Design a protein around this ligand. Structure first.
Ligand SMILES: O=C(c1nccs1)N1CCN([C@@H]2CC(=O)N(c3cccc(-c4ccccc4Cl)c3)C2)CC1
Ligand SMILES: [Cl-]
Length: 289
């Protein structure tokens, strides 16, 4: 039997099989009655769909059907950890899941919610189906990386690829600089479904591809969106949030900046997280009435 990386059979779990034959672990939060809309939650690099439990519960409380999967190489899905043949795999697999749910809830609007790399995936998914999605909620989306970090990575990648230097990595995710909430940092660090390994050069190249593709997509974007961004984001530079506001053609676009907040706004200090939940609730409520 095909099993998760934790050895649990997929036959016992909600799942899908992607176009490459890989099992992806799925998660669903359905309201008791007819949903008003569907919303797909797109997690980021190194994490998984279970990080979004409370936000998903809030959205299902608004009578949306919330759905997600662990991207290939993440969480309880198959694949070598935190690698991908090409970044578009993630987009393709989101569209598979979206298409399979929409046909069983025909006529319902579909939203996207994404954080960080998951926000890049949401942008590229909406740009691939222009006019299709009802709206997108973006939490610190990967639009422009920290320029020092990105430069460092490009230099390292050239040494590995071009000068064949072995076993080099620019390092693992450092959660301590991604939230000011120390309790959330500790919870993340001990989550058994995250990836704590050093960044592989092949995956960093796909993240660079993502940023390049997002840049080309921004003028095609017409989807309504809410963009939430912290001013002290060490990973997704706030300049990218301003770029997205400027270059998207969407007629319905809103930015909220959280002064002093770090990258993971939905796992930040309680005043920030509570605001993030409130703002998402009101934005989605107003667009699902
Ligand atoms: O919940 C948490 C908490 N932190 C503190 C408290 S809670 N999170 C979940 C969300 N991640 C985001 C999601 C995402 O796409 N990220 C991402 C994006 C681009 C690059 C890299 C990267 C950087 C270096 C090495 C390897 C890699 Cl891959 C990571 C990190 C952060 C931690
Ligand atoms: Cl892509």
């Amino acid at each position: 039997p095909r099993r998760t990386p934790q050895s649990i059979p997929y036959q016992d779990l909600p799942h899908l099989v992607n176009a490459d034959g890989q099992y992806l672990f799925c998660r669903y939060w359905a309201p008791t009655g007819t949903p008003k809309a569907l919303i797909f939650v797109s997690h980021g690099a190194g994490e998984h769909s279970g990080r979004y439990e409370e936000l998903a519960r809030m959205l299902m409380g608004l009578d949306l059907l919330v759905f997600a999967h662990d991207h290939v190489g993440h969480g309880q899905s198959e694949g070598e950890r935190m690698v991908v043949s090409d970044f578009h795999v993630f987009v393709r697999d989101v569209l598979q899941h979206v298409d399979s749910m929409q046909k069983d809830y025909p006529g319902l609007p579909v939203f996207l919610l994404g954080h960080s790399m998951g926000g890049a995936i949401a942008i590229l998914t909406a740009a691939e189906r222009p006019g299709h999605f009802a709206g997108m909620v973006l939490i610190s989306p990967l639009v422009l990386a920290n320029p020092e970090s990105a430069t460092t990575f490009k230099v390292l990648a050239a040494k590995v690829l071009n000068s064949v230097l072995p076993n080099l990595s620019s390092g693992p995710i450092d959660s301590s600089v991604l939230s000011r909430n120390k309790t959330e940092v500790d919870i993340y660090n001990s989550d058994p479904l995250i990836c704590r390994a050093g960044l592989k050069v092949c995956f960093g190249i796909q993240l660079l591809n993502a940023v390049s593709r997002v840049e080309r997509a921004l003028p095609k974007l017409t989807v309504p969106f809410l963009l939430l961004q912290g001013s002290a984001d060490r990973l997704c530079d706030s300049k990218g949030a301003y770029l997205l506001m400027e270059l998207a053609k969407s007629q319905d676009k809103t930015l909220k900046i959280y002064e002093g907040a770090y990258h993971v706004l939905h796992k930040e200090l309680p005043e920030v997280t509570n605001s993030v939940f409130h703002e998402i609730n009101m934005w989605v409520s107003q667009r699902t009435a």
